[PDB]
Design a protein around this nucleic acid. Structure first.
Lengths: 178, 70, 117
RNA sequence: UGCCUGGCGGCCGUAGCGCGGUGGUCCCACCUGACCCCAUGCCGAACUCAGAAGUGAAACGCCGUAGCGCCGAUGGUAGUGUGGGGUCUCCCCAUGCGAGAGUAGGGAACUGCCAGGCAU
RNA sequence: CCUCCUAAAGAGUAACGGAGGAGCACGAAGGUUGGCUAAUCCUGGUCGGACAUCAGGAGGUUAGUGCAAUGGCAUAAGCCA
RNA sequence: GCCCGGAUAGCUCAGUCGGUAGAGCAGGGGAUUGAAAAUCCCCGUGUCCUUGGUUCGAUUCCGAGUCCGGGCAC
RNA sequence: CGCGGGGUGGAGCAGCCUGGUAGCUCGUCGGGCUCAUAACCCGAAGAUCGUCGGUUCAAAUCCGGCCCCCGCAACCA
RNA sequence: AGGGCUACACACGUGCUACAAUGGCGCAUACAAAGAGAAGCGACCUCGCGAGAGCAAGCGGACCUCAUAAAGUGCGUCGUAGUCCGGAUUGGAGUCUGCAACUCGACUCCAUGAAGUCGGAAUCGCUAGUAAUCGUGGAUCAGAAUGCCACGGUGAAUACGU
């Protein structure tokens, strides 16, 4: 709800006024949020990636893709073509609704702030909050005494520098141990 | 947004204004602001003299008149 | 999980339940219940959210695992960076309260290793 | 008649790249919305459909700039045909052919077609 | 029996000359429509921080090619439906 | 490429005329001795190979094909 | 010359056939029994597969070079 | 005077506490012996979470004091989950004895909270007020006791036979 409505009126004027952009539309915008568990654990057992997707879906708000391996050699020699990761990808209303369940709920329910002290960005203006465990789930009876697994929160922006890019995000207010 | 990717999005959209009582808000959690150490220990606390917890009744100088007929 | 503080189970009694927080033991848990006006042997599932919040206001008053574990780290670290004898034993993984180091002490010297001959 | 924008070319780096400037109620991008036919191994990003305001920002067209890519003489040099010599593992002589590299210099494109706007 | 060199800028031509492979696979790994584009490194990244999955950038195929080498290919002869 | 004949406890075999899952030895525990070698004990496992079919029900009874082992073929 | 086999924990042997897997008996070290040693019992440790490279996602293993050990061969007038 | 014997890679003997439900936790409740004490032990009193504090009676030993006997009994509670088991560790605050508790004290409390699911080979003590188990006192001793020395509570298996 409120995030895209807030970005529209406030974050576009704020960034325009602080950075004096050449034309208003050149304010940085929010480009897709991709989430992603990655493997978690356990290639071999080959059940758990299908359980990982069914956990991830609830807080994604869409089915996970189930990414499979490229040529691979890391913590095991995965070869190529095995199932491995998870992957989501959001934009528009789905992302703006998501970005409100982040920030409002999920971040204040992380106890020690592994989710954000100081954290730094890519080479241009994209960022990646690797959350440690389990956040919140839809209506009721959230906990089923599961098997942990955090996830990458890779949020993306159209922005030209990481110094500029953190004026964005911060205009929606960003963490209390930051 | 194909039809069969089943979000729970009616529930996830629903119940949307949550209180400070109901689910804490983002108006709670910066409140204990900073991580605080004070290195001016006891005995740096202006205490150059010390005394125990309690027993503070009847304080005067009496030089060991405590035995009952020794 | 996130009941009063972030670390609590259900169907435990309220004296037991808060113990799992870190910074509230058996004595503080009793005293937190006394403070809140709550009976001890109540199932923690039984309490409603405004009662649970009343516990949560007192639970926040002390110290809890995000704040505690940073504090006890900072206390130890101040000794290790200072380099006093206390801190040196704390650095070295041998006993710091002066215990007999000749025979026992396999809490600090851990799981056994061979003679490495 | 000219200037500018778009499609299909011809030739296919002197045509490229960099760097800077610059253009938007023709037009083109981006653009918003996704209702609906349509569509995603999740994702309206892509594809597709329906369209107002917005912006020239990114893309791209245009201009300037030689930093780089690139073209490049003449002469000499190598090599070789044929015929001849000798100190013959190789080189000379006759005369036909004659590079590659490198130097001067050129260099930021020329041009046909139909299509729209603006000025004349 | 195949590929490269010797092989002399058309034919490719010997030597117990130099160097490598094949004796099959495939019912899709064939047909056709439709879409898409590589190795590698960096930077950010919840434990593979030497190497999974992710996102961003540079690069511009340095990759791919059922299997050898040579030729080949982006309109793809590659990869997917 | 035929006719044969087998495919189970881990093994060989087999209670298995269709009404119904075993002997011999293999690994663990208990019970005794200069631990042992060695007694005695209680569990050891199968949709009888994959598919057809007779039937009140049948693996085997009647059948088609894969693999092993034995003959004649070429 | 030439051809083929071999190079494993301190010892002797196994695994080596397009491959991911370290096993046995001795010896060793710690504990035990014994007056004490022997033996006997229990536990543990020990090989980055001669060496260098190559192919491979992965190599002790397959491939190539060198050193080292063995078997056979090095004639015919 | 300060340091040391009280270190640590590790190996061993001896003992404690434990791994739980015959129990741990809570609250209420029962009945001992033996001993020490004028360098000492110290009620009652009011204060302290408590260790302790101060104020102060008393005692020369059947008198006063150390000294609330514990396990047991009552009732509630927990549910085989390394836990309401276990408490090792370490932080922090605190008390006392003493010149001083850093090396090198004891104890209180708050918090935290490991190994541990009854132990391989081996192996020891005991015949009945015994073993097992529960507490109490004392010597030394300013201050350090799981040790040693003693006291009493509850109280067993079985010994055919050589």
């Amino acid at each position: 709800a409120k995030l895209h409505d807030y970005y529209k009126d406030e974050v576009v004027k704020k960034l325009m006024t602080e950075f004096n952009y050449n034309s208003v539309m050149q304010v940085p915008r929010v480009e897709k949020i991709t989430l992603n568990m990655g493997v978690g654990e356990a290639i071999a057992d080959k059940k758990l990636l299908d359980n990982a997707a069914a956990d991830l879906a609830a807080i994604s708000g869409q089915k996970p893709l189930i990414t499979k391996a490229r040529k691979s050699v890391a913590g095991f020699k995965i070869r190529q073509g095995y199932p491995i990761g998870c992957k989501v990808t959001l934009r528009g209303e789905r992302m703006w609704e998501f970005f409100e369940r982040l920030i409002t709920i999920a971040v204040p329910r992380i106890r020690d702030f592994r989710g954000l002290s100081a954290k730094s960005f890519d080479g241009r203006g994209n960022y990646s909050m690797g959350v440690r465990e389990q956040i919140i789930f839809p209506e009721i009876d959230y906990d089923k005494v599961d098997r942990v697994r955090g996830l990458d929160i890779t949020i993306t922006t159209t922005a030209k520098s990481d110094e500029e890019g953190r004026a964005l995000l911060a205009a929606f207010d960003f963490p209390f141990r930051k | 947004m194909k039809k069969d990717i089943h979000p729970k999005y009616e529930e996830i959209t629903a119940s949307c204004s949550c209180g400070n009582v109901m689910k804490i808000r983002s108006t709670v959690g910066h409140d204990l602001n900073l991580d605080v150490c004070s290195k001016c220990h006891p005995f740096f606390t202006g205490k150059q003299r010390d005394v125990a917890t309690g027993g503070r009744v009847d304080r005067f100088n009496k030089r060991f008149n405590i035995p009952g007929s020794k | 999980a996130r009941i009063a503080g972030i670390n609590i189970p259900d169907h435990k009694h309220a004296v037991i339940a808060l113990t799992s927080i870190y910074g509230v033991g058996k004595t503080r848990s009793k005293a937190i219940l006394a403070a809140a006006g709550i009976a001890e042997d109540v199932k923690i599932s039984e309490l409603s959210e405004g009662q649970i919040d009343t516990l949560r206001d007192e639970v926040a008053k002390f110290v809890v695992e995000g704040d505690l574990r940073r504090e006890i780290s900072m206390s130890i670290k101040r000794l290790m960076d200072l380099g006093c004898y206390r801190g040196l034993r704390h650095r070295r993984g041998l006993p710091v309260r002066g215990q007999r180091t000749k025979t026992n002490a396999r809490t600090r010297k851990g799981p056994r290793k061979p003679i490495k001959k």
